[PDB]
Ligand binder design. Structure first.
Ligand SMILES: [Cl-]
Ligand SMILES: [Cl-]
Length: 164
């Protein structure tokens, strides 16, 4: 298991524009297009991202390309974030993947807001962090996925994902 496989399980793969869990236009492997209510706006963002007139449909390779770029960006966002970097640097390889997953889903800014959980992770207080992480909109809105990431932080193993 690795970050790629992990997020592919969490986000799935769709080759046509769809609405994510928050009702926003998305494509591929969780690549958000826009928060705008307009499908045209989404098709426009899509063609600009791909570099061709897609008509709202992309291929598998194109999806994988956006995915590689998004993962890369998530990592770089962590590394450039003064609040995130220290945490990421303190963790082991498995737990680092759990932090990348959260950043990919909710953005650098959203994750940097879990101040108390971040401190606990930094301190290696696993069970405490898991409890603190669960008290969030994130967990109440997407509980099955939140539980998988949380278990990851708690145990430092990929067990929540083995089977998927
Ligand atoms: Cl893009
Ligand atoms: Cl979920």
């Amino acid at each position: 298991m690795n970050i790629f496989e992990m997020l592919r399980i969490d986000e799935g793969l769709r080759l046509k524009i769809y609405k994510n869990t928050e009702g926003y236009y998305t494509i591929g492997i969780g690549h958000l297009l826009t928060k705008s209510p307009s499908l045209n706006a989404a098709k426009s963002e899509l063609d600009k991202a791909i570099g061709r007139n897609t008509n709202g449909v992309i291929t598998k390779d194109e999806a994988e390309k956006l995915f590689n770029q998004d993962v890369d960006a998530a990592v770089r966002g962590i590394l450039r974030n003064a609040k995130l970097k220290p945490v990421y640097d303190s963790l082991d390889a498995v737990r680092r993947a759990a932090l990348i997953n959260m950043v990919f889903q909710m953005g650098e800014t959203g994750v940097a807001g879990f101040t108390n959980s971040l401190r606990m992770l930094q301190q290696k207080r696993w069970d405490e962090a898991a409890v603190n992480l669960a008290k969030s909109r994130w967990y109440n809105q997407t509980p099955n996925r939140a539980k998988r990431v949380i278990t990851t932080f708690r145990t430092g193993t990929w067990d929540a994902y083995k089977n998927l």
